[PDB]
Structure formats: structure tokens, C-alpha cells
Design a binder for this molecule. Structure first.
Ligand SMILES: O=C(O)[C@@](O)(COP(=O)(O)O)[C@H](O)[C@H](O)COP(=O)(O)O
Ligand SMILES: O=C(O)[C@@](O)(COP(=O)(O)O)[C@H](O)[C@H](O)COP(=O)(O)O
Ligand SMILES: [Mg+2]
Ligand SMILES: [Mg+2]
Lengths: 450, 450, 91
């Protein structure tokens, strides 16, 4: 039955009658066809060229049962195509393989001028081949002995240029002042002005000093991001040898294959793994083309990060409130039902994988705390970089202002108060008893991001 | 001199009088500011948040000489911003670090609604920290014993679903019929229907069988892409054990850190490394946002791929001719001068690094050969997947057709003939002696992409 | 011309054979300009002045040292007795 020649993709790969199986992997693509290409043919091309098909009929199609393996577009709602992929198409436990199919080539076809992967339904049968986070929210709270509030953090600034000595000095001032954690900037790895061995040594010394002086458990997210998997693992081992509770990795710039290796070793070493999403905005910013972050967040939890940045909504970087509320649920809950209002196109069963800590960071200061607590609740990290070191009196006073603000708003929420309506009043009440908080509120009162 | 508060980014990070140094890393960004944000401020924000700055002044800025480490926008032409980065900002030999700075966070700022990295000037002093390709064009031509023509390849189809036995049957027919090489699809890793150990074994038996019957050297690009670096290295080692000349990696989905690890091991194993750019169109397609592929090509050559896909221009996937000509030079030449007509914003000295084979693949057939040879010349791989297996008489016949087409056009060019004006005649000439070629021309004569 | 990160290669070229030619009866290498692009292939000191001063907690003065004498002949026990006296005394 081999009939050589080109045929429309929709002949074989558009099936509006197909009923998805619980074992199918489902994708929701927002397709902008080339003018003149019908939506059905465009969605069939995506399905075909992300599973089994190519641009012309091949004699070798007779050597297998394509009906058993082909992906199928089974539903179209406007410019949104739903595609189902049989379980057997994917390599167990490999996000890399998911990407190679779902986003490998289908974004560059002339027939599809724009394409955005909006969401993906990971079947339970496939999730069971992934380990998920190595620590999880509950275990991490026990390790830090911190309950009932968000956790305080902050990126050391300037991003680059500080010696290891001056760098650990800022770390010490922050942790001493009330921050639970501090972190290397995503782009601080090992550079002539600040070599990783020096920084790890100096910083862990500052961590122990602040922990001893405050009586509270502290940590620093030592960035092991490096140019090769071997180098990253070497730095994770040094971090563990020094007694660090945490390491940090840029999981998108380093990449998913190496990220899996680091997550494996982090658990073996007893380290908690903070995951920075550097580069994500290259893929997930534009609504017409790319990969939505909620998909990257799912992949992140599947491989197993202990934290991942989720945006602030109200900070210097872009983030939608509704979509962020849905992403927090994808990271923390056992089961997330579909919700069009939040861009959740599918129900997501997490098959018992551990939850991930959301991390809100980027251009936030005290006045944002009511919003942040309203969005995330207690199970999140709030990071104040400039919002800490930019305090009129320096990092220690800035850390105190942010710690007090967060504890005051978290307490108000637990008391049943409306922290958005009474946000200002909650902060002013705490400011009367805290000069550092007052000075911070005066400094950045006029600083806002739409 | 520390004054707390928010300051304009351009006060420190915009310097239109700065003169770039030969040791500076230079970026060309096409910026779409948030409406109302001046171009100078947007460009300065990109510079500040990709180097040393943040959203508010910090007391710790006094602890280092930011003038020595800060990036600076030194030139703006309309919506293109040129930014210079001092050499000391970057970790030696780490593309991962380059990305963490240059594309880490600056694509997700509210103040910059779209941003595209158009080009990057890698300084010689930083290039000398990278190994480049392990094999290179010249050494590879010696290993295959092929000179004076493009090399023939082809992806096995259907992408997925073939058993290892049937998969190697298609491979043998292609190689027996005239293809120099065949390759696993980017998304074929190890799956229930086709496990990698089986495929590697079956395929290498087919490769040896075709090499003995043809008397020409053959290869198959065995995909080691996997969910972790360790697993990829394990599959590379098995490919070498079997005597394969090649392995293949999806260097963007696997990621740059694991890419470096596989490149290191490939050289140690004596393997040639084909690199598939799966996922590139997610962020190199749209002209308003992302990273142009020419930047990805430079990074690819620095880490050290032996080939990388470059597009076909005339095939099923999008690609501009002028931009592809420049990228081909970037992959193959020792020095590439700037050229506005091709989007080459900077001169690029390659500091003696070995060159990379361009690979043209995707929806091409015999009628495209005149264009392909005209674009790329002899130093390139042309891959015919569907264009081989879709032949009316099967893969071996298709391979003969494509092989005869490429050799006839390559011969015409070496004779001085204008292969674009006489492209059709050159192919009809060969068709009169090659029924396989004639059959292929009739089948796909009416199949064109814009 | 030079292998990255190899002082050994520098010497093999610059001072390998050219000091023993009949045509050049004496030759002295007075200085050498190491270009930045070649320097970036070398790691440099592992500690450095500043880090080392932090490890010893000594600032604002030269540091004191001293070779144990006699050069050779001291037992390990007596050798460490001299060391202790020196360090105890201010070195
Ligand atoms: O480099 C930066 O900008 C930060 O250190 C913030 O510093 P400030 O706290 O001084 O703003 C974080 O990496 C970003 O917030 C990441 O953005 P996201 O969390 O969206 O990935
Ligand atoms: O998956 C595919 O479509 C291919 O196997 C082509 O199959 P055909 O040869 O049957 O078209 C290649 O991976 C693409 O050409 C890659 O695109 P690029 O080279 O632009 O990365
Ligand atoms: Mg940062
Ligand atoms: Mg392919």
C-alpha cells in the first residue's frame, strides 16, 4: 500500500474523533498558521513532525504500525490545537527526550509562522519514571526549623565584581540581620575577581558566624553552575564538604541533561537544590511563540528541584498574577485541576512527587510584601537583593526591615485580616516599632512597577 | 559617596563615548522598550542587569571598582543597542556562563517588552579558553576519504516506531544506495519500540555491510542524547566500542553543560560529533525576541561540534539565504568580517579553532540541489530523509538519485558552469542516464516551499 | 605557535636550541611580553596575597619567615625543636 508522493499532514495526523488515554501525553499548542494554511493542516504538521511523520510518504511506514505510535491532533478550539502522544513514544525519565519531540523542530516550519506550547499533561504512568524533588517543602522546613511564614532570602549585589572577602561580608550582614538565606547571582560562577573555591570557603564561614550569633539556621545558595557537568559536580562536592545546606544551579543555561546529573548528586550529598531559571524569558516571554513557563515548571518538578523562581508579578520582571497562582499550585499540590482562568489547560496528577518551593525575586521591597503573601501564602521564598543592600543603612538593616515586614504580614494573614486591604496599615503598625522598616518604607514608597 | 535610592540605569551603564577593547565581549541587541521608556534607558537596563547592576543603588557598590567590571552600552542605532562586556566578567571556557549573563534575566524585564540578541563578538583572548571542534572539516574528509563534493546524509524515517531490525534495514539500503551517512532522528533516543543498545548493534552491522559491498566509507550518527550526562557518556562509549565513526547529540535540548561533557569524551574516544539543533526555533525564529542562530552557531563552534544543522533556505523549515551564507562563513572560516547585508554585526576572528561542517536538512529533494550547492559549496552535508525513503522505488533508489544529483551539480560548479541558471539542465542531463534520478524529479517536481 | 597553558612549550621554543648555535656565542633572554590572549590559558596563583593575608590574619606589615639551620643533619625531633622556638619567638 506504499503510494509515493506528498500528502497533507491532516490525512494521517488529524483525528477529531480520537479520545485521549490516561497514558497519553497531551499538549496544547497555540498555532499561528502561515496565511493560507488551514488550522487543521497546521496542527497536523505539528503532530506529525513531533512524533513519526515527515514531509513525504516513505516506504518504511509499512514496517511498523503508525496507528499505534503516531501523535494525533484530536481537538481544535480557535487557534489552540490539542495533540495526544502515545506513552510509548517517550524515553522513561528523560525530559531531554520530551523536548526533542515536542519542541525539537515544529517551531521552525514555514507552514507554521508562530507556535507556543501552552501546557502539557504528563500521564501518571510517565511521571512514575521521574524522581521529583530530592528534599521537598516539608523536609526543608524541618531542616531550617522555620514554620508558619515565608522564608527570607536575597541575591548579593553587585552581581559581579566583589572579592570573596567583601562578598562574604555582605552575606554575613544579611544573614545576621534576619534573612534566612542569601544566594550567588545566576551569573556568578568562577571568574578572575571571585573564584569559586575562595567564595565557598569565605561564605560558609560567614554562614556559620551568623547562625551562631542569631541562633537561627542559615544557608547560602552557592552557585555550582559551570561549563561542564563534571565541573558542576566537583563544586557541589566541595559545598557539601564545607557543610553547606544548599547549592544552586541555573538549570536552563546549564541544561536539563546536566541538571539531572546535579540533582542526582545533590541528593547523594544531602544538599538542597535551588534552581534559578536564567534564560527562561528567552523562550517564555512572548504570547505568540515559545514555551510557557508553566511547562518548564512541570519539567522542573519532574527532574526534581527543591526551589524554582516563579516571578513576583509586582516586581521588576514580568509575570501574570492568575498564571502565577496556577504555577504555584503546579509546584506545590498533589493534584491540580484544569482552570481556563489561570491558563491550566489540563488536570495534572503529580503521582506523589514531592512539592517545590516557589521563589519570588526581582525588584521587590517592603511595600510589595502584602501582595507577595497574598499571592503565595507562607510556602515560598521572598528574595530581596537591592531591597536589602539598598537600605539607607546597609544590608543588615535592610535584612531586618524585610524580615519584620514579612513576619508582620504573615501574622496578619493568619489572624484572618485582609492583608491587601490593610496592607499599608499592617506595615505602618510594624514600622512604629522598627526604624529600619520605617526607613525602607520611606525610601521606596514611590518605586512601583505596573 | 553611597546615596541610597533608585537611579537611572543609563547614568552608569550608558556611555556613548566608550571605545571597545579587543578583549571586550560585544553584543548587538535589538530592543523593543516598554512604551514610554527611552531607548537609552532600555539599553542601559540590559547592560546593567547582564553585568553588575540592579534596580536600586546598593552600599556594596563602593566595595569594588564597577568602572572596571560594568558592561556599557556604547552605541545605539535606532532599535539596535551595542553593549561591551569586560573580559574579566566571564568564566573561562564556559558557554554556560556567557548565557547566564547575556541572556539570563534581561529578556523578562517589564521595561523591555521584547529583546533579540542579534550577534556577539567573541574576543580572541576569551576564544583561547575553548577547545573548538575535536575533528574539523579537513580531518573528517580524510577519515571518510571524500573530497571535492558535498557529503550525502539522511534521517531514517518514520521518525519513531521502527524496530531495531527494520531500522537497520533502512540504514543498509540508504548506505548501499549512495548515501555517505544516515542518522537517528533527534527524538529517537531509547524507547520501548527501539532501545538504544539494540539499535547501535543492528546499525553498525548494517554500516559495515554497506561499507564492504560499496568499497566506500560509511557512517551512522548514533544519537546518544539522553536524560542525564552519565547516560549520554555511556552511550558514546558503546558507540566507540562498536567502531562507529560518529555519535550525535541534540546539544540544545541536552544542554550546553552536558554538551561540553560529551564533546570532551568524544575526542577521547576518537568519535566525530554531529550536533542537532533541536529546540533552536523556539527562540531564534522571531525577529523581535530571542537569540539569532548565528550566535548559537558561534557557541557551537567554541564548545566543539564537528557538524551543526544550518537550515536549507529552500526546504520545509524557515531560513534566510543571506543570513545562512554568513553563518556558513562563521562555521568554516578563520576570520569573518562584518557584513550588514548578512546580519554580521561584528568581525569574528576564530583564533585558529577548527571549522565545522554545515548540515542542510529538512524537506529537500533532487530539485533543490542546484540551490544547495550554490549556497554552501562543497564543504557541507546535504541530508535527504523523506527525499530518500519517499522515492517511488525505496531508499536505495532514492539514495542513488540524491547521490547522482549532488555529484552532477558539484561537477558542474567545478567546471565553472552557472549551476543556478543551468540547474534544471544539469539535472535533466544526469536524469537521462539515471532512471532513479528521473523518477525522483517527476515525483517532487511540483513540491516547492516559499 | 604556543600550546595553551604550557610554560614547558614556551621554553621548548624560546630557549630550546637557540642558546647553543655556533653563530651565536652568547645569548640572554632579557624579557618577554606574554599577551593577554595567552595569559587567559593559565590559572595563576591558587591563593594570592589578599587571601593569604586573610588566612594568617596579618595586615599592614611584612611577614616574618626563616629557614631552619643547619641545612641538613638535624633529626626530625631536633628540627621541630628549632621550628617551635622560632615560631614561639615571633616568626
Ligand atoms: O539577578 C537578578 O535580577 C536577581 O538576583 C534579583 O536581584 P534583585 O533582588 O536586586 O532585583 C534575580 O536573579 C532575579 O529576580 C531573577 O528573576 P526571576 O526570579 O524572574 O527568574
Ligand atoms: O526531523 C526532521 O524533520 C529531519 O530529520 C528532516 O527530516 P526530512 O529529511 O525527512 O525532512 C531533521 O531533523 C530536520 O531537517 C532538522 O531541521 P534543521 O536541519 O533545520 O535543524
Ligand atoms: Mg540574580
Ligand atoms: Mg529529525
Amino acid at each position: 500500500q506504499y503510494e509515493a508522493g506528498v500528502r497533507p499532514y491532516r490525512e494521517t495526523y488529524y483525528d477529531p474523533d480520537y479520545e485521549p488515554k490516561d497514558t497519553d501525553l497531551l499538549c496544547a499548542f497555540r498555532i499561528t498558521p502561515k496565511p493560507g494554511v488551514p488550522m487543521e493542516e497546521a496542527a497536523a504538521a505539528v503532530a506529525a513532525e513531533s512524533s513519526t511523520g515527515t514531509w513525504t510518504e516513505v516506504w518504511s511506514n509499512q514496517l511498523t504500525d503508525l496507528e499505534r505510535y503516531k501523535a494525533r491532533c484530536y481537538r481544535i478550539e480557535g487557534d489552540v490545537a490539542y495533540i495526544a502522544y502515545p506513552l510509548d513514544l517517550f524515553e522513561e525519565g528523560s525530559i531531554v527526550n520530551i523536548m526533542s519531540s515536542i519542541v525539537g523542530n515544529v517551531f521552525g516550519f514555514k507552514a507554521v509562522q508562530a507556535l507556543r506550547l501552552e501546557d502539557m499533561r504528563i500521564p501518571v504512568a510517565y511521571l512514575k519514571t521521574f524522581p521529583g524533588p530530592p528534599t521537598g517543602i516539608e523536609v526543608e522546613r524541618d531542616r531550617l526549623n522555620v514554620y508558619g511564614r515565608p522564608l527570607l532570602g536575597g541575591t548579593i549585589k553587585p552581581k559581579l565584581g566583589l572579592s570573596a572577602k567583601e562578598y562574604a561580608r555582605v552575606v554575613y550582614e544579611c544573614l545576621r540581620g534576619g534573612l534566612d538565606t542569601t544566594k550567588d547571582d545566576e551569573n556568578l560562577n568562577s571568574q578572575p575577581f571571585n573564584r569559586w573555591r575562595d567564595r565557598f570557603l569565605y561564605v560558609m564561614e560567614a554562614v556559620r558566624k551568623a547562625e551562631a550569633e542569631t541562633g537561627e539556621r542559615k544557608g547560602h545558595w552557592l552557585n555550582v553552575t559551570a561549563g561542564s557537568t563534571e565541573e558542576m559536580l566537583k563544586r557541589a562536592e566541595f559545598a557539601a564538604e564545607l557543610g553547606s545546606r544548599y547549592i544552586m544551579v541555573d538549570f536552563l543555561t546549564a541544561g536539563f541533561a546536566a541538571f539531572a546529573s546535579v540533582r542526582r548528586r545533590a541528593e547523594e550529598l544531602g544538599l538542597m537544590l535551588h534552581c534559578h531559571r536564567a534564560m527562561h524569558a528567552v523562550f517564555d516571554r512572548q504570547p505568540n511563540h515559545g514555551i510557557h513557563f508553566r511547562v518548564l515548571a512541570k519539567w522542573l518538578r519532574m527532574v526534581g528541584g527543591d526551589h524554582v523562581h516563579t516571578g513576583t508579578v509586582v516586581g521588576k520582571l514580568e509575570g501574570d498574577r492568575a498564571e502565577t497562582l496556577g504555577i504555584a499550585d503546579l509546584l506545590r499540590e498533589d493534584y491540580v485541576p484544569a482552570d481556563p482562568g489561570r491558563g491550566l489547560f489540563f488536570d495534572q496528577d503529580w503521582a506523589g512527587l514531592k512539592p517545590v518551593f516557589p521563589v519570588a525575586s526581582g525588584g521587590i521591597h517592603v511595600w510589595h510584601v502584602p501582595d507577595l503573601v497574598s499571592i503565595f501564602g507562607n510556602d515560598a521564598f521572598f528574595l530581596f537583593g537591592g531591597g536589602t543592600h539598598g537600605h539607607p543603612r546597609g544590608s543588615r538593616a535592610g535584612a531586618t526591615a524585610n524580615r519584620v515586614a514579612v513576619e508582620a504580614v504573615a501574622a496578619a494573614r493568619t489572624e484572618g485580616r485582609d492583608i491587601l486591604a490593610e496592607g499599608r496599615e499592617i506595615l505602618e503598625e510594624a514600622a512604629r516599632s522598627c526604624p529600619e522598616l520605617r526607613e525602607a518604607m520611606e525610601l521606596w514608597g514611590d518605586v512601583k512597577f505596573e
